[PDB]
Amino acid sequence: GLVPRGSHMYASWTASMSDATQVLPGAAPAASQSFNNQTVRHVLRLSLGGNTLRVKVSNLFGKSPITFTAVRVAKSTGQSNIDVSTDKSVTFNGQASVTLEAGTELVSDAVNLEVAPLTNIAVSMYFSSPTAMPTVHALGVQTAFIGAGNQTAATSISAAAADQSQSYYGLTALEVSSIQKTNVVVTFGDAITDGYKSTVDASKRYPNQLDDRLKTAGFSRIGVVNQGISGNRWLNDFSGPSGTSRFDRDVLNVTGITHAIILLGVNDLGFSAWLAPTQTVTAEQVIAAMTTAIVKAKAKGIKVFVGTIIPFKGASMGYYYTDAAEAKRQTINTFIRNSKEIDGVIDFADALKNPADPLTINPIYDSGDALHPNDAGYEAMAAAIDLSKLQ
Numbered sequence: 401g402l403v404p405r406g407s408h409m410y411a412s413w414t415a416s417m418s419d420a421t422q423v424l425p426g427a428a429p430a431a432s433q434s435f436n437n438q439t440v441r442h443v444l445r446l447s448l449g450g451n452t453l454r455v456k457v458s459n460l461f462g463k464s465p466i467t468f469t470a471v472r473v474a475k476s477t478g479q480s481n482i483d484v485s486t487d488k489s490v491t492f493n494g495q496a497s498v499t500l501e502a503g504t505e506l507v508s509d510a511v512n513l514e515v516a517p518l519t520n521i522a523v524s525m526y527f528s529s530p531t532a533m534p535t536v537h538a539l540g541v542q543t544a545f546i547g548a549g550n551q552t553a554a555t556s557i558s559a560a561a562a563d564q565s566q567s568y569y570g571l572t573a574l575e576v577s578s579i580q581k582t583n584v585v586v587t588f589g590d591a592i593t594d595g596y597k598s599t600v601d602a603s604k605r606y607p608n609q610l611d612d613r614l615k616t617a618g619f620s621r622i623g624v625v626n627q628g629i630s631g632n633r634w635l636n637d638f639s640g641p642s643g644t645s646r647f648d649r650d651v652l653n654v655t656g657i658t659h660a661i662i663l664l665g666v667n668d669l670g671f672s673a674w675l676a677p678t679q680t681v682t683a684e685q686v687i688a689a690m691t692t693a694i695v696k697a698k699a700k701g702i703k704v705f706v707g708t709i710i711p712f713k714g715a716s717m718g719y720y721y722t723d724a725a726e727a728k729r730q731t732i733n734t735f736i737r738n739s740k741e742i743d744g745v746i747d748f749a750d751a752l753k754n755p756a757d758p759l760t761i762n763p764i765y766d767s768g769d770a771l772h773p774n775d776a777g778y779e780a781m782a783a784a785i786d787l788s789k790l791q
């Protein structure tokens with residue numbers, strides 16, 4: 401019959417936030433990016449279409465307030481170009497400018513812009529004042545465009561090509577409304593979820609390719625949002641807040657979440673040889689963190705899938721991969737494969753391993769560093785997933 405007409409918002413695109421000034425123990429301080437009387441135009445791919453949208457901005461890791469002088473949205477026509485006929489003001493309690501205190505985030509008013517799944521929109525921000533922006537999604541795998549003055553409504557960004565970036569600045573979610581029954585699948589992880597080594601501006605991150613499979617199969621109302629952070633660890637901050645500490649924000653609190661795919665831990669194992677020797681952790685400590693996350697998500701009624709840790713022998717031997725890291729990987733994967741608490745295993749390790757040597761990534765899927773898949777490897781990750789799990 402007629403679908404009940406009550407409208408609801410769903411996360412259509414997400415980006416997990418990191419503090420660009422946070423560094424490893426003993427490391428030299430790191431400076432944040434700043435803007436001063438400048439516009440940043442971001443581009444992002446929507447997983448879910450619908451009738452209206454809203455924008456979530458962030459000063460989560462600011463050390464002082466920031467003021468978004470203007471925020472605008474439009475359909476992207478490639479590079480920095482927009483369809484000016486679709487340009488809309490993004491307001492916050494009716495105001496075009498909004499100030500976020502340090503440590504806070506804010507979702508905008510609804511914007512009347514009809515959008516389709518797997519299309520790109522541009523979200524443009526003007527900062528009139530000197531604005532420090534430590535709150536970023538560092539690894540965007542996507543070009544952002546920076547220019548002088550308020551260009552938020554301009555057809556393109558006029559600037560030098562050296563002013564571009566591949567990060568997202570203070571932009572963390574895009575939510576879209578619909579009356580239809582809708583699933584939201586959150587992919588939670590490290591660089592292998594974030595999509596490091598996939599082709600920039602090509603939407604070839606593994607969650608993008610999973611999304612492609614869903615829409616090709618007809619499931620336009622099953623969305624996939626990305627909560628990976630390159631370099632992320634369960635148990636310790638850097639890169640990004642620890643997985644344990646960000647799970648509530650980046651998984652449980654995602655608007656409309658129904659399913660989660662968790663793939664995290666290789667950095668907990670790999671960082672201790674050299675990057676962070678004071679932060680050695682056991683497989684048991686990783687398993688305990690996973691357990692608490694699984695319990696929390698199941699209590700919220702989320703379907704929880706855990707991926708096996710992909711082989712990584714050859715990845716900076718002696719300085720990331722070690723015999724100790726391999727032993728812990730096998731203990732963790734045994735735990736995953738035998739868990740009766742999770743709703744299912746997604747065996748990424750089995751899908752991507754080298755048939756000639758199961759401790760290495762299949763050479764046809766190796767980006768070249770023995771750790772991160774290439775586009776074909778991210779395609780193979782997506783292909784391994786039983787879409788019945790996401791219903």
Ligand SMILES: CC(=O)O[C@H](C[C@@H](O)C[C@@H](C[C@H](O)C[C@H](O)C[C@H](O)C[C@H](O)CCO)OC(C)=O)C[C@@H](O)C[C@@H](O)C[C@H](C)O
Pocket residue numbers: 539590591592596629630631632639666667674715716719720769771
């Ligand atoms: C899964 C995940 O999240 O992955 C990534 C981290 C991972 O890349 C860490 C490295 C290994 C280190 O580099 C190894 C050191 O280099 C060894 C040192 O050099 C030895 C020393 O020189 C001897 C001197 O005697 O994994 C690798 C490459 O194996 C996530 C993220 O950080 C990627 C991001 O940073 C890319 C952005 C554009 O920055």
Ligand SMILES: [Cl-]
Pocket residue numbers: 745746747784785786789
């Ligand atoms: Cl599966």
Ligand SMILES: [Cl-]
Pocket residue numbers: 785786787788
């Ligand atoms: Cl399938």
